[PDB]
Design a protein around this nucleic acid. Structure first.
Lengths: 183, 251, 50, 117, 88, 112, 88
RNA sequence: UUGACCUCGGAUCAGGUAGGAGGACCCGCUGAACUUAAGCAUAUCAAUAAGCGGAGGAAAAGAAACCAACAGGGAUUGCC
RNA sequence: AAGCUCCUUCGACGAGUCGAGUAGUUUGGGAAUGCUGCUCAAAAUGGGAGGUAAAUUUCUUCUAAAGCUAAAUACCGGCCA
């Protein structure tokens, strides 16, 4: 149940213990590189909930991206930028999923969970050999992660008529003139 | 003193002008106009529809407000306007229709924000027992106490309530003084123009027994349901005609 | 129990100005001996010259 | 209504008979694979939603759990013997329950089962 | 409308999504104790001990954004104060 | 449902004294007309007549109010040197002025 | 372009008051400026817009102060005239 | 004196993997103007062209925090 | 190893995420149509979306912030016919 205790603790973010840990940890990340290998998940409950397993093949990389805006607003998220940069550095791995770990005033810190598609453990284990399949190359670059789905608007209902099933696809379908043989 | 009033006898009245969640931009503009005209009253943002309506009586106690003007929007189309006295007074629910706001450029009139208004009421407001309870609730809300420190000193506008249909028509005019020909008043409409159909008066702050119910109110949702039923009836009539014609053809 | 319609020491309108002048610029009254009017309709005279 | 570029977004259906032939060949591919079996699954009878169309019934997605139970067909066996299952639908009425259990009884009466291996 | 015989449906666990978990409530209480309070919660506690409960409600609304959230936060903090007084 | 006794009881519980023998018009500033706007509006769809009736009711109220307030000694006329915030902004008055200008210009231009 | 005086444009009430307007086509009562103080205040305003922009803050303040003093003396003299004609 | 753990490194260490091409169709980012109309301004062209990134034989979407208000329907996709 | 049945026993469901304010962009869609950036920052008979003048916010319908999945669909490119 320790993961449930950590879930409640992580929901209590501005509490004294979590605030102290986030401060001293933000200083560490600022002393380290902008993108670096994290030996272990800093938030194990979040990692395991997002799909991190303690196998050979699951890697965690931490990244800091500058926050703010370009008054122009970027349509994708800082999560998407961090995921794309981590994937480009680890071009041989598949980006499984990322999560916020620390904010700071000038940067923003995300840990990205990645899977090795070429490792034998990953290849033999189901539940991950789907990411071994070649249709999942650079999901972070194509918007196939959680932040990509959120930004593209993959929800069902009246509030997502234009954006579900692909915005450009829907626009093209609505703007095609269909002419049949017997008109 | 803590009243923000300087007068021999103090009419200590304060209003909480509050909006619901599904309120549209036109209703928000109306609320802004009324709040600007009310110096003893302060704004309040979207109110949860899942909350109980008497929770509005504990919001009033927080801001020390004895009167509440509640804008409840239904389907994002219809405004229902509530007037109450918290915590034990009468409450009135109205349906608000025909809204025009001060930003409409056909008005031509303007007035001092906070100036005390001359309140004009039609004669029916002293005849029908229900319209007399609405009157005291209007006087307490759109009254602007005598010595309130947030008021302006010179008075230049009249707020009129008239009973023309079974509805209350609210108008706002600037009193323009023009010299007589060898000073008299002209009126120029300045502000909000809305119509209120009374629905219920209930003895209580937002509950208790009902003292008045219209029995003649037609709902916009009733109109919409009638239109939908008419469309369905047309389709059903076409289907019935097809069936009867097929039977006759078989015969 | 009834409510006392009174302002507490936390309300934005506890301390109300005497000027009875709204959010308008003071570019007006630049050439006038007075600055605004009070509640009772009496104008507020400028204090002195520095 | 041609303010946009319909010329670069225009589509013609010159392959209507070609797609018809392709779909017919696909149905024969399914029946070559599932040769003694019907090329579809048994679908329930459902009343259309709105007041405009509530006088008629159509075919739904799948049969409900308790109407399968009343028909006597086990849950884990129905998709295997060729019955569509819909865990989202609720009967809410003895009329729909009875209509669908009668349909499943008719399927039972007209079905032939082969004994495993 | 039409006359159809109503059927009593079984309870839905998706409807039982409403949380009655005693163990989850235990975990929330223990984590509250261990982690402590946010600075705005400290402000609300300070106001509640000094009796400025109306001000506390106003500040909680300003920090959270909704009457209901402010009310629940103030109730939780008042429970913390009562339990602390009982424990001391 | 029209409970007149209950309506009057509730009215008594919230009624602030407005009797002119003891309460001044400067204190209450509410005028009740001596005639119905019903009797002056034959047809409710006639916008001109409806607005005229409303304006006349407000005008009678304003005249009586000015008389009573000048009797009681309350300032009424806004001084030329009193500049204060309005319920409608200078920008809004500028747009109203500009639309008036363009309407008059269009009419006189058609005449020319 | 046509003048707002030529066009029958109504006066609009803003932060600058319209005041008691005069009926159109009727006798606009002529108020006469023959007092030395009234000439002083009109002259002070005229010289203010003629001189215009001044770098020195104290100089701008003194210009505004002399206009204010002119208005004050005008008001005092007019009130004195009012008193004189009301009593004697 | 020695030995564990943590963290960080070296190696032409053992075994692997990415880059580029193609881009008709597909998923994202970025992003105009010519044109039309209107006192003026928004709007229109167009969420298009151009630019950048990423896959496949399809891609994408997808098994309701959906639609409804009915006697209800029941993941996604496409045609009328 | 598995399915079902019954029950004097249990039943854990995703947080800088919802939401509030605000700026830009976008949509037929200020109940903001969606998205992004900044500030604040949740809940547990909870949360989201609708219905409703019906007298109080009753009723209806679903569980978001983790993931996979063929077919019907597109195609000026690839191997051909």
């Amino acid at each position: 149940g320790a993961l449930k205790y950590l879930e409640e603790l992580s929901k209590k973010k501005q509490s004294d213990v979590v605030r102290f840990l986030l401060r001293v940890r933000c200083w560490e990340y600022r002393q380290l590189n902008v993108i670096h290998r994290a030996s272990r998940p800093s938030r194990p409950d979040k990692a395991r909930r997002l799909g991190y397993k303690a196998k050979q093949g699951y890697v965690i990389y931490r990244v800091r991206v500058r926050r703010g805006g370009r008054q122009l607003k970027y349509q994708r998220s800082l999560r998407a930028t961090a995921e794309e940069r981590v994937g480009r550095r680890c071009s041989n791995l598949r980006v499984l999923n990322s999560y916020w770990v620390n904010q700071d005033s000038t940067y923003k810190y995300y840990e990205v969970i990645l899977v090795d598609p070429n490792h034998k453990a990953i290849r033999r284990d189901p539940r991950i050999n789907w990411i071994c399949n070649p249709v999942h190359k650079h999901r972070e670059c194509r918007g196939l992660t959680s932040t990509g789905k959120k930004s593209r608007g993959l929800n069902k209902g009246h509030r997502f008529n234009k954006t579900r099933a692909g915005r450009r696809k829907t626009w093209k379908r609505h703007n095609t003139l269909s002419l049949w043989r017997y008109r | 003193d803590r009243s923000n009033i300087i007068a021999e006898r103090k009419n200590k009245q304060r209003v909480l002008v509050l909006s619901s969640r599904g309120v549209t931009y036109r209703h928000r503009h109306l609320l802004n106009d009324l709040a600007s005209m009310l110096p003893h009253g302060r704004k309040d943002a979207k109110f949860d529809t899942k909350s109980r309506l008497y929770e509005l009586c504990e919001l009033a106690e927080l801001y020390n407000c004895n009167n509440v003007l509640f804008f409840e929007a239904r389907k994002g189309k219809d405004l229902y306007m509530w007037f109450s006295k918290v915590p034990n007074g009468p409450t009135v629910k109205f349906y608000a229709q025909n809204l025009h706001t001060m930003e409409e450029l056909h008005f031509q009139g303007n007035c001092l924000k906070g100036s005390r208004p001359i309140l004009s009421f039609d004669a029916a407001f002293e005849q029908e027992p229900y319209l007399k309870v609405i009157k005291e609730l209007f006087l307490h809300t759109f009254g602007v106490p005598q010595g309130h420190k947030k008021s302006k000193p010179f008075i230049d506008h009249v707020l009129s309530f008239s009973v023309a249909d079974g509805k209350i028509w609210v108008r706002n005019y600037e009193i323009r003084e023009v010299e007589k020909v060898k000073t008299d008043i002209n009126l120029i409409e300045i502000g909000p123009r809305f119509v209120l159909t009374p629905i219920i008066i209930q003895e209580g702050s937002f509950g208790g027994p009902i003292l008045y119910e219209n029995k003649r109110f037609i709902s916009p949702n009733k109109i919409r349901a009638e239109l939908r039923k008419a469309k369905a009836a047309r389709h059903h009539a076409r289907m019935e005609q097809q069936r009867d014609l097929l039977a006759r053809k078989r015969q | 129990d009834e409510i006392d319609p009174v302002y507490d020491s936390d309300d934005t309108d506890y301390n109300v100005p005497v000027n009875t002048i709204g959010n308008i610029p003071l570019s007006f009254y630049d050439s006038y001996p007075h600055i605004g009017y009070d509640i009772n309709g009496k104008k507020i005279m400028r204090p002195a010259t520095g | 209504h041609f303010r946009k570029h319909w010329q670069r977004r225009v589509r013609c259906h010159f392959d209507q008979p070609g797609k018809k032939v392709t779909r017919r060949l696909a149905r024969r591919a399914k029946a070559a694979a599932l040769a003694p079996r019907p090329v579809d699954k048994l679908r329930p009878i459902v009343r259309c939603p709105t007041v405009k169309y509530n006088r008629r019934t159509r075919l739904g997605r799948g049969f409900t759990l308790e109407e399968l139970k009343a028909a006597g067909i086990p849950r884990l066996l129905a998709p295997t013997i060729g019955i569509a299952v819909d865990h989202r639908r609720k009967n809410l009425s003895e009329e729909s329950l009875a209509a669908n259990v009668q349909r499943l009884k008719d399927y039972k009466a007209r079905l032939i089962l082969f004994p495993r291996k | 409308g039409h006359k159809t015989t109503r059927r009593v449906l079984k309870e839905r666990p998706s409807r039982r999504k409403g949380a009655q978990s005693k163990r989850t409530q235990f975990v929330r209480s223990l984590i509250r104790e261990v982690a402590g309070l946010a600075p705005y919660e400290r402000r609300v506690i300070e106001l509640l001990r000094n009796g400025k409960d109306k001000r506390a409600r106003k500040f909680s609304k300003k920090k959270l954004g909704t009457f209901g959230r402010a009310k629940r936060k103030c109730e939780e903090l008042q429970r913390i104060i009562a339990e602390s007084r009982r424990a001391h | 449902i029209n409970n007149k006794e209950g309506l009057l009881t509730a009215l008594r519980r919230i009624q602030l004294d407005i009797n002119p023998k003891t309460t001044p018009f400067s204190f209450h500033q509410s005028v009740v007309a001596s005639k119905r706007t019903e009797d002056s509006i034959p047809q409710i769809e006639d916008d001109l007549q409806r607005e005229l009736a409303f304006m006349n009711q407000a005008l009678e109220a304003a005249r009586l109010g000015r008389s009573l307030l000048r009797k009681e000694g309350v300032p009424f006329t806004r001084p030329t040197d009193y500049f204060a915030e309005m319920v409608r902004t200078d920008a809004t008055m500028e747009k109203v002025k500009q639309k008036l200008i363009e309407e008059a210009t269009a009419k006189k231009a058609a005449a020319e | 372009v046509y003048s707002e005086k030529e066009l029958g444009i109504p006066q609009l009430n803003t932060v600058t008051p319209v005041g008691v307007t005069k009926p159109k086509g009727k006798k606009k009562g002529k108020v006469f400026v023959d007092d030395r103080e009234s000439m002083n205040t009109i002259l002070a305003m005229v010289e203010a817009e003629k001189q215009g922009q001044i770098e020195s803050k104290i100089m701008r303040a003194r210009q505004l102060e002399e206009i204010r003093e002119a208005r004050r003396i005008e008001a005092e003299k007019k009130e004195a005239e009012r008193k004189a004609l009301l009593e004697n």
